[PDB]
Design a protein around this ligand. Structure first.
Ligand code: CA
Length: 449
């Protein structure tokens, strides 16, 4: 019964306005929805006649001039501040460069037109012409962030923050004045949360959970392209400005260096996969390549959580869509992602008869890889045993599942949730599980019915 119509929105940032969900993305790709499943595209590029920011080159002359670019802005996020106006935080840049700026535009109406408000953070200063970086020292792209990818959020106390960054100096957070949206004076680039020295991370987003009273920091590791191994990582903190820690207890301030090294940190939520045993490219089969650059939302009306992200697809190169999935909290207060896109599903306790059976099983691992992971077959048996491709034991308590799986010479415990979801490709309701270990590895199970 559920149906879908996606949008084409790269780097999507969610905002709810009235009964309508909007996503704002790179190139001023904008779309909206009442149900999270059918999306109406309202803008597709930052051309001179777009209605979101008309005549953008003149309107945002300050940031675009800085970035030496035209007809484009990257990773915009709109947030409603206390005056009721809509503030679009965005960045201007060029591919591969740290010559970037974070700006703010403002509108009275969600769909615009937005006008210039402020220029707030700059990177890529060339000392002989521009002078120092924001911290008063010469810009050094190993230490200083790239002024990209703003993630703005209120904390539980009403303070306003912006987490930001992409590669280069890492991921930083600035405290903002709730009344103006501007960074409070005297912070330079702010506090470093993750990364440094050109570590492959970007798109930071922070979400508060009332259900656990933690803040969750979402990052994308790797490259966004087909061969980049883009993957979504999660850490959490009792404080909006950290330190953030992963499920193993590692501090994300220590996450920096090579791809192999940074891969050791964070809960990896999803990487590349396809639900085909046949082949790694199978256009009938559900699968993603380079899912990332996400935002997230908590809906107080229902208590559900959602992740908004773009992704590419097996065998389809750089083509991408918006996708929306539900997130759940496991018994340890960590997020686990629903295998399939959101079709209206609400978790509840399943009886045993709906749990027992053969599953396709995907282990997403811990690495940053472009490998398209495929499933193996396992069975969850009535006696609590796991058999097939892996051995172990499973148990459940309400909708919380625990899987204890033998991996080499050790048992790894995965904790997650069980529910019924809409099988996106098979078009039927099926049992699924999604679970996470303390080493930050996600597993998905999709019941063969
Ligand atoms: Ca973002």
């Amino acid at each position: 019964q559920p149906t879908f119509r996606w949008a084409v929105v790269h780097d999507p940032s969610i905002i709810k306005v009235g009964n309508m969900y909007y996503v704002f993305g790179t190139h001023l790709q904008v779309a909206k929805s009442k149900d999270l499943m059918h999306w109406e595209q309202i803008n597709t590029s930052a051309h001179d006649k777009n209605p979101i920011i008309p005549n953008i080159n003149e309107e945002l002359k300050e940031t675009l001039s800085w970035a030496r670019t035209r007809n484009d802005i990257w990773a915009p996020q709109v947030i409603q501040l206390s005056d009721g106006r809509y503030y679009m935080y965005y960045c201007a840049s060029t591919f591969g460069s740290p010559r970037s700026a974070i700006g703010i535009a403002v509108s009275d109406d969600i769909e615009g037109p937005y006008k210039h408000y402020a220029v707030i953070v700059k990177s890529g200063q060339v000392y002989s012409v521009d002078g120092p970086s924001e911290d008063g020292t010469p810009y050094d792209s190993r230490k200083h962030p790239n002024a990209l990818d703003p993630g703005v959020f209120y904390d539980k106390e009403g303070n306003l923050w912006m987490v930001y960054g992409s590669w280069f100096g890492g991921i930083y957070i600035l405290k903002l004045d709730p009344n103006t949206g501007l960074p409070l004076p005297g912070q330079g680039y702010g506090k470093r949360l993750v990364g440094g020295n050109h570590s492959s991370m970007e798109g930071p987003y922070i979400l508060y959970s009332p259900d656990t009273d933690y803040y969750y920091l979402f990052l994308s590791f790797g490259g966004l392209d087909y061969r980049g191994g883009y993957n979504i990582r999660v850490a959490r903190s009792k404080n909006p400005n950290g330190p953030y820690y992963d499920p193993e207890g590692k501090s994300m301030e220590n996450c920096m260096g090579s791809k192999t090294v940074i891969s050791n940190y964070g809960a990896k939520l999803v990487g590349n996969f396809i639900l085909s045993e046949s082949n790694t490219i199978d256009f009938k089969a559900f699968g993603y390549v380079s899912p990332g650059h996400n935002s997230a939302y908590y809906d107080p009306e229902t208590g559900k959580y959602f992740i908004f992200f773009h992704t590419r697809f097996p065998g389809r190169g750089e083509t991408y869509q918006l996708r929306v999935h539900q997130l759940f909290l496991n018994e340890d207060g960590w997020f686990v992602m629903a295998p399939f896109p959101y079709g209206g599903e609400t978790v509840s306790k399943l009886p045993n008869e709906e749990i027992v059976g053969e599953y396709q099983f995907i282990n997403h691992g811990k690495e940053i890889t472009d490998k398209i992971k495929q499933p193996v077959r396992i069975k969850l048996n009535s006696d609590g045993s796991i058999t097939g491709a892996v051995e172990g034991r499973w148990e459940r308590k309400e909708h919380y599942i625990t899987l204890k799986i033998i991996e080499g010479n050790t048992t790894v415990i995965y904790k997650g949730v069980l529910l019924k979801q809409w099988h996106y490709s098979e078009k039927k309701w099926v049992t699924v599980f999604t679970a996470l270990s303390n080493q930050g590895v996600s597993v998905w199970g999709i019941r063969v019915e």
